Amino acid sequence: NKTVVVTTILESPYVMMKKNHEMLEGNERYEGYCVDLAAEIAKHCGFKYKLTIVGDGKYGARDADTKIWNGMVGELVYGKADIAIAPLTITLVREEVIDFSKPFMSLGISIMIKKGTPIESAEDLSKQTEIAYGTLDSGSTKEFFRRSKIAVFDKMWTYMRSAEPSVFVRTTAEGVARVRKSKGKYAYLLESTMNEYIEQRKPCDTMKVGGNLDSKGYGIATPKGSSLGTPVNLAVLKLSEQGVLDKLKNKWWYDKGECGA
Amino acid sequence: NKTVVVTTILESPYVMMKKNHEMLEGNERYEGYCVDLAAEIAKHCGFKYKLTIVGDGKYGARDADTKIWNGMVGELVYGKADIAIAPLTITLVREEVIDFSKPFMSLGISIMIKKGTPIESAEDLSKQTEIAYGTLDSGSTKEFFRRSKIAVFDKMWTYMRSAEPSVFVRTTAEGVARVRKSKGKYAYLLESTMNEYIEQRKPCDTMKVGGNLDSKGYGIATPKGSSLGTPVNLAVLKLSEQGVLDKLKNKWWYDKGECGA
Ligand SMILES: CC(C)S(=O)(=O)N[C@H]1Cc2ccc(Cn3cc(CO)c(C(F)(F)F)n3)cc2C1
Ligand SMILES: N[C@@H](CCC(=O)O)C(=O)O
Ligand SMILES: N[C@@H](CCC(=O)O)C(=O)O
Incomplete structure (x- = not known):
């Protein structure tokens, strides 16, 4: 049992810096849908974790010349992060080099x-x-x-x-x-x-x-062959079924609406 | 390489008996969304297959006394079928005893x-x-x-x-x-x-x-630990991306509409 390094990305309402973030330290600097979801997945899988923003600020693509992956996909691939918890879309070019849980949200x-x-x-x-x-x-x-x-x-x-x-x-x-x-x-x-x-x-x-x-849909992503892959996926299915995924959508979309009804 | 036994269920527009079915034999007795999808998955995975209707006509539940699974889930579990290709919903109680591909359709x-x-x-x-x-x-x-x-x-x-x-x-x-x-x-x-x-x-x-x-969502299901699990899943992602899944939805829903516009 070791502290899991979560790669994620600054994207509203998924992960945002709190306004007093320079007050704060650690996971407490951040708020959002995926902040809340990371705390649920970590509870149901029994792990401790560090939220960290992708250094290059990208989702993940592969340079056609170098074949080097950038973004959160590349963080996983090159072993800098243990799990990506973000609005990261499930694709074939990606599902090749990383694993995705079942989709936690559709788009x-x-x-x-x-x-x-x-x-x-x-x-x-x-x-x-x-x-x-x-x-x-x-x-x-x-x-x-x-x-x-x-x-x-x-x-x-x-x-x-x-x-x-x-x-x-x-x-x-x-x-x-x-x-x-x-x-x-x-x-x-x-x-x-x-x-x-x-x-x-x-x-x-x-x-x-x-x-x-x-x-x-978006999936939680782990490097190919991680031991976190199956627990994380059962945790998404279960939170689906508990209604926790719908409850967090409402919280960060509908309840955050400022443009009337 | 062996002929795959596909378990499926009579459910409109997914799998229906053609009207002249007593004329016909084999896979040709059937038409539908999941008939069309089975033919695509079999092509992209490189296998030969037999469509077969679940003997008991059920999706799959477990008796709380016997703990025996019935339906298509039980066909997979007890090794009577190799793959289930049907409107079979991805659930936690099921994902335990069988594997599901990523969702090919939402509901x-x-x-x-x-x-x-x-x-x-x-x-x-x-x-x-x-x-x-x-x-x-x-x-x-x-x-x-x-x-x-x-x-x-x-x-x-x-x-x-x-x-x-x-x-x-x-x-x-x-x-x-x-x-x-x-x-x-x-x-x-x-x-x-x-x-x-x-x-x-x-x-x-x-x-x-x-x-x-x-x-x-619905997933393609294989018994726990099947060699068909990963190829089938890459095939769903790829058909997603090729637009083949949307094209088959249109065919069997929108194009089949008899109630006006
Ligand atoms: C293989 C690709 C097509 S995909 O990007 O991974 N799937 C697409 C299509 C689709 C369908 C339903 C759903 C909704 N859904 C939520 C859950 C809970 O895990 C689930 C559950 F996995 F449980 F079925 N579904 C999402 C998506 C996105
Ligand atoms: N969710 C997308 C990024 C957003 C977009 O491409 O519009 C991805 O994971 O690449
Ligand atoms: N698709 C459902 C059956 C339909 C329903 O329960 O309404 C299942 O796989 O159990």
């Missing part, structure tokens, strides 16, 4: 606009040029478009990969900031979960439009 | 009424007595209510377990038949997937009402 790629933007769908975006759009770097959303064989999404990806200036953003906060400050002339593609939280946060100037483009 | 428990029934929610059902309601025997929906510690669902379960005549049904077709032929005086609790298919099938006299009561 699909969605479109965020400034209120008033004449865009209702992904089709609407691919058929025009006035409103720019993009995704996050180093993540599952970017790769969905890169590797897509569907007509509209390949059209979107060819626009996106060569557009000037860049339509790609380093953090979600950056994509959101660009929607808000671009006067309706940028739309952001992000996961439905993140979009729905932000949609209900002041200044209440963004909106989610269109149906989800895919159906995926 | 929640939902409420089906005859059109015109004054019921909008699960709360509405628990607070009245004129309209009877129940679930399927030997399945995850029945166990959700039995083991629930939430107020409304425990209230529902206490009513349901001792109501006369029985509110429990052996097959989904039976629950649906009871809604249709009970003049609004029975409501059925079933998975949202099954409800949404039936809702769009003639005589177009049922309706799904209220939000889902839980968030679960």
